[PDB]
């Protein structure tokens, strides 16, 4: 599944709902800390719609548990990420992923 650990608290009040657009900064890392992706490197917040399944399952369910302003560490099992196949060249098979996610606003 996905484990959500707070880095810095949000408002504790505004949680994203299905159909809402979520605006975040994130960094994605393998288990050894190797970064494979980061919106912060692009200096461009990333937007996705909750429930569209345009992000991995661990994000769908993990970010849904975050409040606006919150920064959290999401630890995501492979079945909630890229599974047995992984993404060859980037993500190994059966990889646990760690994401640093900051929820900036809802749209």
Author numbering: 1 to 107
Lines quoted from the article behind this entry:
Since these hydrogen exchange measurements utilize mildly basic conditions for extended time periods, we substituted valine for Cys22 of wild-type FKBP12 to circumvent the chemical modifications that can occur at cysteine residues under such conditions. We found that substitution of valine at position 87 dramatically suppresses the minor state of the slow exchange transition. Given the 12% population of the minor state in wild-type FKBP12, the H87V substitution shifts the equilibrium of the slow exchange transition at least 60-fold or by more than 10 kJ/mol. To gain further structural insight into how the H87V substitution so dramatically alters the dynamical properties of the protein, we carried out a crystallographic analysis of this variant protein at 1.70 Å resolution (crystallographic summary). Beyond the changes in covalent structure caused by substitution of valine for histidine at residue 87, there is strikingly little alteration within this region of the protein. The Cγ1 atom of Val87 lies upon the histidine Cγ atom of the wild-type structure, while the valine Cγ2 projects toward the face of the aromatic ring of Tyr82 which is not displaced but appears to become more constrained. Of the nine aromatic phenylalanine, tyrosine and tryptophan residues in FKBP12, the ring atoms of Tyr82 have the highest average crystallographic B-factor in the wild-type structure, but the lowest average B-factor in the H87V structure. This rigidification of the Tyr82 side-chain mobility is consistent with the reduced conformational dynamics of the Tyr82 backbone that is indicated by the marked narrowing of the amide resonance of this residue in the H87V NMR spectra. The H87V mutation appears to lock the protein in a conformation closely similar to the major form of wild-type FKBP12. The peptidylprolyl isomerase activity of FKBP12 is unaffected by the substitution of valine at position 87.
